[PDB]
Amino acid sequence: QCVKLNDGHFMPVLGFGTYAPPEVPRSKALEVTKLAIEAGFRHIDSAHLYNNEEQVGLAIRSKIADGSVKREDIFYTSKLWSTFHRPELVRPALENSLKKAQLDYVDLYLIHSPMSLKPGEELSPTDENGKVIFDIVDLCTTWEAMEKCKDAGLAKSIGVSNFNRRQLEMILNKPGLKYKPVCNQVECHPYFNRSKLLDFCKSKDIVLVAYSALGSQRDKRWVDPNSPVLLEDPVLCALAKKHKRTPALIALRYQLQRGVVVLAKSYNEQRIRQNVQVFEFQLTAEDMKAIDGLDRNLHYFNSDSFASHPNYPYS
Ligand SMILES: NC(=O)c1ccc[n+]([C@@H]2O[C@H](COP(=O)([O-])OP(=O)(O)OC[C@H]3O[C@@H](n4cnc5c(N)ncnc54)[C@H](OP(=O)(O)O)[C@@H]3O)[C@@H](O)[C@H]2O)c1
């Protein structure tokens, strides 16, 4: 099952999340991406930041080599990291990602975040106070460079991530705009359901892609351990019991029924296989209303590191 993007390409509505924290050996991404493909995932979400494109790319190539899939069956996403927003750095960044993954093109290239950072060696250049050293870049210029990447065939589609409505509007209203973003990949789950942003995106034919749809990996770098654990929510657990599914499946299905494309990260073989069951059942209107009632403006990613950034999208 796919949705048609505003540039004519097609995106599978369920995607595999590949990020794992640095404490996880790099080789694991190879193993789990192959498992994901074997389970039925075709949309695979990576990024320069993840330090895994070589392993994820190898998994894709391996599954093409053994005849399981063809390149055209896979929808591969990468993302431009924030130290590469200056327009002259965009195509080189994409070319580096392609080289790592050993792919001729990405299906989707995203601006990972609107929060531009100082260019250089470090992924996350930080001051002595812990905050990231910011760069002030007109993102419309970054976008123009993204458009050139699509015209060159390096990316089939281009989009953004972590943009709010105002930031999207800035791109959409850019004079001489050639390609609208096909999507906005954002934090989205029952505790932070982004309903207003979703309505806006639908009105502009921009797909909303949900990350942390299962409540995030709760990494101590960015997430308060006090934050309620999404999958422990009693409404989600009651719905799981009602449907004889799992809280994760309820959370994924919720997104699909709102017209949101949903990612799901798992590095566990059993959970990877479980997550594809999202297509096997439905939630009723009353179920959906119960889940909508959980909305509580809880973005799990919530750190000083970026809450002070001039382009921080949340308010
Ligand atoms: N654009 C961005 O700024 C951004 C930000 C965050 C995420 N992302 C993308 O979105 C992906 C997913 O988001 P996320 O990394 O925050 O994780 P997530 O999809 O919210 O998953 C959170 C945790 O759920 C667990 N899980 C998965 N399936 C489960 C199941 N069926 N039952 C119980 N637990 C389950 C996983 O643990 P196990 O691995 O142990 O199964 C995982 O660590 C990322 O990997 C990345 O590709 C993008």
Swiss-Prot record:
Marked site (Important for substrate specificity) residue numbers: 49
Gene Ontology CC, one term: cytosol
EC number: 1.1.1.-, 1.1.1.210, 1.1.1.53, 1.1.1.62
Active-site residues per Swiss-Prot or TrEMBL entry: 50
Domain of life (superkingdom): Eukaryota
Annotated positions binding NADP(+): 18-19, 45, 161-162, 185, 211-217, 265-267, 271-275
UniProt entry keywords in alphabetical sequence: Cytoplasm, Lipid metabolism, NAD, NADP, Oxidoreductase
Residues reported to bind substrate: 112
Protein name: Aldo-keto reductase family 1 member C3
Species assigned in the record: Homo sapiens
